[PDB]
């Protein structure tokens, strides 16, 4: 049975994902930035309203993952905060200017994260030396890695993704980027244990007066369909 | 005595702004989203390192200001958080579908805000009736409003801003959108009490293996404070 993780940009979307079969949620803010740390209000809101596992992303800004000491100070505090709020895991990633995992920094994040299941995000796809990196993530105690096989979308990086899976058992490899109902079977047939999807859609602004404004939300039906595909596939596997 | 407020997307940028003359900082995250609520980590960081007044923006997402019940619940908790952390003010705004200030929900925010000085942001430039909105803001107890005179840039809307300033003594009118060292004197001559500027630029990523970051320009901040100082010192 493959694990279905849905990226949500609001508490309502995470709830919709939960009610539609999602096994886990990656909680983010700012879709146009690729996902940034949610405000404390959103975090607390989700802890009070969402029951399935929620992993908040810890990312102060978009762009690269070579944070300054100031941004890093905030990141450590956010990690401690997410742990204290009771989340079972979190998502983050830090690299040096050459694309190598910043080990000293990641170790400090792991220490602050405590028992939390940490996901090293797509910073992995911007890094050099995939295997060497996986070995080091395993050394840090990273639970899983969100990756597209270092390609524009996970389907293109499918052969690489399979390589990662066959290289080490840990961290768990989670396919992400462009993963949708139409191509889910590719990942399942390849033996991917966890898949990440935005199950995104655009809802028009209800704004009647003006002078973009569409909201990026989770399509509940899309989530259910993907979970359906996952259940049948695991079933077809006898 | 014109007040210079700088929009900063990081603690370090806020510090740079402070070291260069900024009288106040609007703290935001997500420059590409037009500015969203900063995380607790960033907020705590600024409280321990920045001394001039800082007003964090409270905005869960980009786009319109007609938030869902779920988003609004988060907004109230963030107002409560910013207040509890001791910031002297905050920036936010909620509108109904017809371009009117959402009074029932804005009232709940004011209640949660307590003594904090609340700035109604550019949601104001999306309102159908500016003078009536100013009235509504004063009714709410709003301290100041960030506006471009309802134009694409504040200079273009300057004549409108001058009209707003004389209308009433409701919230303070703070000119924003396109304000920079180059055109600052226009707003000062117009009689604007407070001005807002991001005074920044997108910085290239230092990555040597394969990419931008929005940072404040401390020189620009310093130049603007100079213009302000010289203005009422001429
Ligand atoms: Ca390698």
Coordinates of C-alpha atoms and ligand atoms in Angstrom, one line a residue:
Chain A
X1 CA 0.0 0.0 0.0
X2 CA 1.7 3.2 -1.2
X3 CA 1.5 6.3 1.1
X4 CA -0.3 9.3 -0.3
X5 CA 1.0 12.7 0.9
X6 CA -0.9 15.9 -0.2
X7 CA 0.7 19.3 -0.2
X8 CA -1.8 21.8 1.4
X9 CA -1.6 25.6 1.6
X10 CA -4.3 26.0 4.3
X11 CA -6.0 24.3 7.2
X12 CA -9.2 23.8 5.1
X13 CA -7.3 22.1 2.3
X14 CA -5.5 19.8 4.8
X15 CA -8.9 18.8 6.2
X16 CA -10.3 18.3 2.6
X17 CA -7.3 16.0 1.9
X18 CA -7.9 14.1 5.1
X19 CA -11.5 13.6 4.4
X20 CA -10.6 12.4 0.9
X21 CA -8.2 9.6 1.7
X22 CA -4.8 11.4 2.1
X23 CA -2.5 9.5 4.4
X24 CA -0.4 12.6 5.2
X25 CA -0.2 16.3 4.6
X26 CA 2.7 18.6 4.0
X27 CA 1.6 22.0 5.3
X28 CA 2.9 25.1 3.6
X29 CA 2.1 28.7 2.9
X30 CA 2.8 30.8 -0.2
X31 CA 2.3 28.6 -3.2
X32 CA 3.9 31.2 -5.5
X33 CA 7.1 30.8 -3.5
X34 CA 7.1 27.0 -3.7
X35 CA 6.1 26.7 -0.1
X36 CA 7.2 28.6 3.0
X37 CA 6.7 28.1 6.7
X38 CA 3.1 28.6 7.9
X39 CA 2.4 31.3 10.4
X40 CA 1.8 30.2 14.1
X41 CA -1.9 30.8 13.6
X42 CA -2.1 28.3 10.8
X43 CA 0.1 25.8 12.6
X44 CA -2.1 25.9 15.7
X45 CA -5.2 25.8 13.6
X46 CA -4.1 22.6 11.9
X47 CA -3.1 20.9 15.1
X48 CA -6.6 21.6 16.4
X49 CA -8.4 20.5 13.3
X50 CA -6.4 17.9 11.4
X51 CA -6.0 14.3 12.7
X52 CA -3.9 12.6 10.0
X53 CA -0.1 13.2 10.1
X54 CA 0.9 16.7 9.2
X55 CA 4.5 17.8 8.4
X56 CA 4.9 21.6 8.2
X57 CA 7.6 22.9 5.8
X58 CA 10.3 25.0 7.5
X59 CA 11.5 27.4 4.8
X60 CA 11.8 31.2 5.4
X61 CA 12.0 32.2 1.8
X62 CA 11.9 30.9 -1.8
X63 CA 14.9 30.4 -4.0
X64 CA 18.1 28.6 -2.9
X65 CA 18.6 26.7 0.4
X66 CA 21.8 28.5 1.4
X67 CA 20.3 30.4 4.3
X68 CA 22.0 33.2 6.2
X69 CA 22.7 33.0 10.0
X70 CA 19.6 35.1 10.6
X71 CA 17.3 33.0 8.5
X72 CA 18.9 29.9 10.1
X73 CA 18.3 31.2 13.6
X74 CA 14.6 31.5 12.7
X75 CA 14.6 28.0 11.1
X76 CA 15.9 26.4 14.3
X77 CA 13.2 28.2 16.4
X78 CA 10.6 27.1 13.9
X79 CA 11.8 23.5 14.2
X80 CA 11.6 23.7 18.0
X81 CA 8.1 25.3 17.7
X82 CA 6.7 22.7 15.4
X83 CA 8.1 19.9 17.7
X84 CA 6.5 21.6 20.7
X85 CA 3.1 22.0 19.0
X86 CA 3.0 18.3 18.6
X87 CA 3.5 17.7 14.9
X88 CA 4.8 14.2 14.1
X89 CA 7.3 15.4 11.5
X90 CA 8.5 18.4 9.4
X91 CA 9.9 19.2 6.0
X92 CA 13.1 21.2 5.4
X93 CA 16.5 21.3 3.7
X94 CA 19.8 23.2 3.7
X95 CA 22.7 23.2 1.2
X96 CA 26.0 24.9 0.9
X97 CA 26.9 27.1 -2.1
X98 CA 28.1 24.1 -4.1
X99 CA 25.0 22.0 -3.7
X100 CA 26.3 19.7 -1.0
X101 CA 24.0 19.1 2.0
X102 CA 25.1 21.5 4.7
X103 CA 25.9 18.8 7.4
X104 CA 26.6 21.0 10.4
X105 CA 23.4 22.9 9.8
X106 CA 21.3 19.8 9.2
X107 CA 22.7 18.2 12.4
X108 CA 21.4 21.2 14.4
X109 CA 18.0 20.9 12.8
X110 CA 17.9 17.2 13.6
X111 CA 18.8 18.0 17.2
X112 CA 16.1 20.6 17.5
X113 CA 13.6 18.3 15.8
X114 CA 13.9 15.6 18.5
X115 CA 11.7 12.6 17.8
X116 CA 10.1 14.2 14.7
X117 CA 10.2 12.4 11.4
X118 CA 12.1 14.8 9.2
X119 CA 11.7 15.0 5.4
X120 CA 14.5 16.4 3.4
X121 CA 12.7 18.2 0.6
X122 CA 13.4 19.0 -3.1
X123 CA 16.6 20.7 -2.1
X124 CA 17.7 17.2 -2.8
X125 CA 17.0 17.7 -6.5
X126 CA 19.3 20.8 -6.5
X127 CA 22.2 18.9 -4.9
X128 CA 25.2 17.2 -6.4
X129 CA 26.1 13.6 -5.9
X130 CA 22.6 11.9 -5.3
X131 CA 24.0 8.6 -3.8
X132 CA 26.6 10.3 -1.6
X133 CA 23.8 12.7 -0.5
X134 CA 21.4 9.8 0.4
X135 CA 24.1 8.2 2.4
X136 CA 24.6 11.4 4.4
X137 CA 20.9 11.9 4.9
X138 CA 20.7 8.4 6.3
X139 CA 23.5 9.3 8.6
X140 CA 21.6 12.4 9.8
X141 CA 18.6 10.3 10.5
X142 CA 16.4 11.8 7.8
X143 CA 13.2 9.7 7.6
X144 CA 12.4 10.4 3.9
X145 CA 13.4 12.5 0.9
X146 CA 11.0 14.3 -1.4
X147 CA 12.4 14.0 -4.9
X148 CA 11.7 14.2 -8.7
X149 CA 14.8 12.1 -9.5
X150 CA 16.5 15.5 -10.0
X151 CA 14.4 16.2 -13.1
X152 CA 11.7 18.8 -14.0
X153 CA 9.1 16.3 -12.8
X154 CA 9.2 13.0 -11.1
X155 CA 8.1 11.0 -14.1
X156 CA 11.1 12.2 -16.1
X157 CA 13.3 11.3 -13.1
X158 CA 11.7 7.9 -12.7
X159 CA 14.8 5.9 -13.6
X160 CA 16.8 8.0 -11.1
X161 CA 14.1 7.6 -8.4
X162 CA 14.3 3.8 -8.8
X163 CA 18.1 4.0 -8.5
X164 CA 17.7 5.8 -5.2
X165 CA 15.2 3.2 -3.9
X166 CA 17.6 0.4 -4.8
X167 CA 20.6 2.2 -3.3
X168 CA 19.4 2.4 0.3
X169 CA 16.3 1.5 2.3
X170 CA 16.6 4.7 4.3
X171 CA 15.7 7.4 3.9
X172 CA 12.5 6.4 2.3
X173 CA 12.1 7.8 -1.3
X174 CA 9.0 9.8 -1.9
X175 CA 8.2 10.8 -5.5
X176 CA 7.1 14.4 -6.0
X177 CA 6.6 17.1 -8.7
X178 CA 4.0 16.6 -11.4
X179 CA 2.6 13.5 -9.7
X180 CA -1.1 13.2 -10.6
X181 CA -3.8 10.6 -11.2
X182 CA -2.8 10.3 -14.8
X183 CA 0.7 9.1 -14.1
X184 CA 0.4 7.6 -10.6
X185 CA 0.6 4.0 -11.9
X186 CA 4.1 4.6 -13.2
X187 CA 5.4 5.2 -9.7
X188 CA 3.4 2.4 -8.1
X189 CA 4.6 -0.1 -10.7
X190 CA 8.1 1.0 -10.0
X191 CA 7.8 0.2 -6.3
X192 CA 7.7 3.7 -5.0
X193 CA 6.4 3.5 -1.4
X194 CA 5.4 7.2 -1.0
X195 CA 4.0 9.7 -3.4
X196 CA 3.6 13.5 -3.0
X197 CA 1.0 15.5 -4.9
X198 CA -0.5 19.0 -4.8
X199 CA -3.9 17.7 -6.2
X200 CA -4.1 21.4 -7.0
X201 CA -6.8 23.4 -8.7
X202 CA -7.8 27.1 -9.1
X203 CA -10.9 28.5 -7.5
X204 CA -11.9 31.9 -8.8
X205 CA -12.0 34.9 -6.5
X206 CA -15.6 35.7 -5.3
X207 CA -14.6 39.3 -5.6
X208 CA -17.4 41.3 -7.4
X209 CA -15.6 44.6 -7.4
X210 CA -12.1 45.3 -8.7
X211 CA -9.6 48.1 -9.4
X212 CA -3.7 37.2 -9.9
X213 CA -6.7 36.7 -7.6
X214 CA -7.5 33.0 -8.1
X215 CA -6.8 30.8 -5.0
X216 CA -4.7 27.7 -5.3
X217 CA -6.6 24.9 -3.4
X218 CA -6.7 21.2 -3.0
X219 CA -9.2 19.3 -5.3
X220 CA -10.9 16.8 -2.9
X221 CA -12.0 14.7 -5.9
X222 CA -8.4 14.5 -7.2
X223 CA -7.2 13.3 -3.8
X224 CA -9.9 10.6 -3.6
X225 CA -9.2 9.4 -7.2
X226 CA -5.5 9.0 -6.4
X227 CA -6.2 7.1 -3.2
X228 CA -8.6 5.0 -5.2
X229 CA -5.8 4.2 -7.8
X230 CA -3.5 3.4 -4.9
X231 CA -5.9 1.0 -3.2
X232 CA -6.8 -0.9 -6.4
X233 CA -3.1 -1.2 -7.4
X234 CA -2.2 -2.6 -4.0
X235 CA -5.2 -4.9 -4.5
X236 CA -4.4 -5.9 -8.1
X237 CA -1.0 -6.9 -6.6
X238 CA -3.0 -9.9 -5.3
Chain B
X1 CA 9.1 65.1 10.5
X2 CA 8.0 62.7 7.8
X3 CA 7.9 59.1 9.0
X4 CA 9.9 56.5 6.8
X5 CA 8.6 53.0 6.9
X6 CA 10.5 50.2 5.1
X7 CA 9.0 46.9 4.0
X8 CA 11.5 44.1 5.0
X9 CA 11.3 40.4 4.2
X10 CA 13.8 39.3 6.8
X11 CA 15.3 40.1 10.2
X12 CA 18.6 41.1 8.7
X13 CA 16.9 43.4 6.3
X14 CA 15.0 45.0 9.2
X15 CA 18.3 45.5 11.0
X16 CA 19.9 47.1 7.9
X17 CA 16.8 49.4 7.5
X18 CA 17.2 50.4 11.2
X19 CA 20.9 51.1 10.9
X20 CA 20.2 53.3 7.9
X21 CA 17.5 55.6 9.3
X22 CA 14.2 53.7 8.9
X23 CA 11.7 54.9 11.6
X24 CA 9.6 51.8 11.2
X25 CA 9.6 48.4 9.5
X26 CA 6.7 46.4 8.1
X27 CA 7.9 42.8 8.5
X28 CA 6.8 40.3 5.8
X29 CA 7.6 37.0 4.3
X30 CA 7.0 35.7 0.7
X31 CA 8.0 38.7 -1.5
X32 CA 6.6 37.0 -4.6
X33 CA 3.2 36.8 -2.9
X34 CA 3.2 40.5 -2.1
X35 CA 4.0 39.8 1.5
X36 CA 2.6 37.2 3.9
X37 CA 2.7 36.5 7.7
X38 CA 6.3 35.7 8.9
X39 CA 6.8 32.5 10.9
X40 CA 7.1 32.5 14.7
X41 CA 10.9 32.0 14.3
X42 CA 11.3 35.1 12.3
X43 CA 9.0 37.1 14.6
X44 CA 10.9 36.1 17.7
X45 CA 14.2 36.8 15.9
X46 CA 13.1 40.4 15.1
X47 CA 11.8 41.0 18.7
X48 CA 15.2 40.1 20.1
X49 CA 17.3 42.1 17.6
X50 CA 15.3 45.1 16.2
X51 CA 14.6 48.1 18.3
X52 CA 12.6 50.5 16.1
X53 CA 8.9 49.8 15.8
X54 CA 8.1 46.7 13.8
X55 CA 4.6 45.9 12.4
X56 CA 4.3 42.3 11.1
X57 CA 1.9 41.8 8.2
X58 CA -0.9 39.4 8.9
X59 CA -1.9 37.8 5.6
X60 CA -2.3 34.0 5.1
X61 CA -2.1 34.1 1.3
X62 CA -1.8 36.3 -1.7
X63 CA -4.6 37.4 -4.0
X64 CA -7.8 38.9 -2.6
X65 CA -8.7 39.8 0.9
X66 CA -12.0 37.9 1.2
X67 CA -10.6 35.2 3.5
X68 CA -12.3 31.9 4.3
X69 CA -13.5 31.1 7.8
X70 CA -10.4 28.8 8.2
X71 CA -8.0 31.5 7.1
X72 CA -9.7 34.1 9.3
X73 CA -9.4 31.8 12.3
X74 CA -5.6 31.7 11.6
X75 CA -5.5 35.5 11.2
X76 CA -7.0 36.1 14.6
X77 CA -4.5 33.7 16.3
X78 CA -1.7 35.5 14.5
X79 CA -2.9 38.9 15.7
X80 CA -3.0 37.4 19.2
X81 CA 0.5 36.1 18.7
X82 CA 2.0 39.3 17.4
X83 CA 0.3 41.1 20.4
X84 CA 1.6 38.6 22.9
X85 CA 5.2 38.9 21.4
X86 CA 5.0 42.6 22.1
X87 CA 5.1 44.2 18.6
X88 CA 3.7 47.8 18.8
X89 CA 1.5 47.3 15.7
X90 CA 0.6 45.0 12.8
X91 CA -0.6 45.2 9.2
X92 CA -3.7 43.5 7.8
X93 CA -7.0 44.0 6.0
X94 CA -10.2 42.2 5.1
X95 CA -12.7 43.1 2.4
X96 CA -16.1 41.7 1.4
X97 CA -16.9 40.7 -2.2
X98 CA -18.2 44.2 -3.1
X99 CA -15.0 46.0 -2.3
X100 CA -16.1 47.3 1.1
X101 CA -14.2 46.9 4.3
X102 CA -15.5 43.7 6.1
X103 CA -16.6 45.5 9.2
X104 CA -17.8 42.6 11.3
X105 CA -14.6 40.7 10.8
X106 CA -12.3 43.7 11.0
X107 CA -13.9 44.5 14.4
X108 CA -13.0 41.0 15.7
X109 CA -9.4 41.7 14.6
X110 CA -9.3 45.0 16.4
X111 CA -10.5 43.3 19.5
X112 CA -7.8 40.7 19.2
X113 CA -5.3 43.5 18.4
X114 CA -6.0 45.3 21.7
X115 CA -3.6 48.3 22.0
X116 CA -1.5 47.5 18.9
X117 CA -1.4 50.2 16.2
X118 CA -3.1 48.6 13.3
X119 CA -2.3 49.5 9.7
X120 CA -5.0 48.7 7.0
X121 CA -2.9 47.8 4.0
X122 CA -3.4 48.3 0.3
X123 CA -6.6 46.3 0.5
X124 CA -7.7 50.0 0.7
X125 CA -6.7 50.6 -2.9
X126 CA -9.2 47.9 -3.9
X127 CA -12.1 49.5 -2.1
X128 CA -15.0 51.1 -4.2
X129 CA -15.4 54.1 -2.0
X130 CA -12.2 55.6 -0.6
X131 CA -13.6 58.5 1.6
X132 CA -16.3 56.2 3.1
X133 CA -13.6 53.5 3.6
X134 CA -11.4 56.1 5.5
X135 CA -14.5 56.7 7.7
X136 CA -14.9 53.0 8.2
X137 CA -11.3 52.7 9.2
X138 CA -11.6 55.5 11.7
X139 CA -14.7 53.9 13.1
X140 CA -12.7 50.7 13.6
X141 CA -9.9 52.6 15.4
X142 CA -7.4 51.9 12.6
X143 CA -4.2 53.8 13.2
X144 CA -3.0 54.3 9.6
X145 CA -3.7 53.2 6.0
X146 CA -1.2 52.3 3.3
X147 CA -2.4 53.6 -0.1
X148 CA -1.3 54.5 -3.6
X149 CA -4.2 56.9 -4.0
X150 CA -5.9 53.8 -5.6
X151 CA -3.5 54.1 -8.6
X152 CA -0.9 51.7 -10.0
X153 CA 1.8 53.8 -8.1
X154 CA 1.5 56.4 -5.4
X155 CA 2.9 59.2 -7.5
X156 CA 0.2 58.7 -10.0
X157 CA -2.3 58.8 -7.2
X158 CA -0.7 61.7 -5.3
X159 CA -3.4 64.2 -6.0
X160 CA -5.9 61.7 -4.7
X161 CA -3.7 61.1 -1.6
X162 CA -3.7 64.9 -1.0
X163 CA -7.5 64.8 -1.1
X164 CA -7.6 61.9 1.4
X165 CA -5.3 63.8 3.8
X166 CA -7.7 66.8 4.0
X167 CA -10.9 64.7 4.1
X168 CA -10.6 63.9 7.8
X169 CA -8.1 63.1 10.5
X170 CA -9.2 59.5 10.4
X171 CA -6.3 57.1 10.0
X172 CA -3.0 58.6 9.1
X173 CA -2.4 58.4 5.3
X174 CA 0.8 56.6 4.5
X175 CA 1.8 56.7 0.8
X176 CA 3.1 53.5 -0.7
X177 CA 3.8 51.7 -4.0
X178 CA 6.6 53.0 -6.1
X179 CA 7.9 55.5 -3.5
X180 CA 11.7 55.9 -3.7
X181 CA 14.5 58.3 -3.2
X182 CA 14.0 59.6 -6.8
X183 CA 10.4 60.8 -6.2
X184 CA 10.3 61.2 -2.4
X185 CA 10.3 65.0 -2.5
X186 CA 6.9 65.0 -4.3
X187 CA 5.2 63.2 -1.4
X188 CA 6.9 65.4 1.1
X189 CA 5.9 68.6 -0.7
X190 CA 2.4 67.2 -0.9
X191 CA 2.3 67.1 2.9
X192 CA 2.3 63.3 3.4
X193 CA 3.0 62.4 7.1
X194 CA 4.3 58.9 6.5
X195 CA 5.8 57.1 3.5
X196 CA 6.3 53.4 2.8
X197 CA 9.0 51.8 0.6
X198 CA 10.5 48.4 0.0
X199 CA 13.7 50.1 -1.2
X200 CA 15.0 46.7 -2.3
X201 CA 16.2 44.5 -5.2
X202 CA 16.4 40.9 -6.2
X203 CA 19.8 39.5 -5.3
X204 CA 21.3 36.7 -7.3
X205 CA 21.8 33.4 -5.6
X206 CA 25.4 32.6 -4.5
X207 CA 24.9 29.0 -5.8
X208 CA 27.9 27.8 -7.7
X209 CA 26.2 24.5 -8.7
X210 CA 23.0 24.3 -10.7
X211 CA 18.0 31.8 -7.9
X212 CA 17.2 35.2 -6.4
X213 CA 16.5 36.7 -3.0
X214 CA 14.8 40.0 -2.2
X215 CA 16.9 42.2 0.1
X216 CA 16.7 45.9 1.2
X217 CA 19.1 48.5 -0.1
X218 CA 20.5 50.2 3.0
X219 CA 21.9 53.1 0.9
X220 CA 18.5 53.8 -0.6
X221 CA 17.0 53.8 2.9
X222 CA 19.7 56.2 4.1
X223 CA 19.3 58.5 1.1
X224 CA 15.5 58.7 1.7
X225 CA 16.0 59.6 5.4
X226 CA 18.4 62.3 4.2
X227 CA 15.8 63.8 1.9
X228 CA 13.3 63.7 4.7
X229 CA 15.7 65.4 7.1
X230 CA 16.8 68.0 4.6
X231 CA 13.1 68.7 3.7
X232 CA 12.0 70.2 7.0
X233 CA 15.5 71.6 7.6
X234 CA 16.0 73.4 4.3
Ligands
LIG1 CA1 26.8 10.2 -5.8

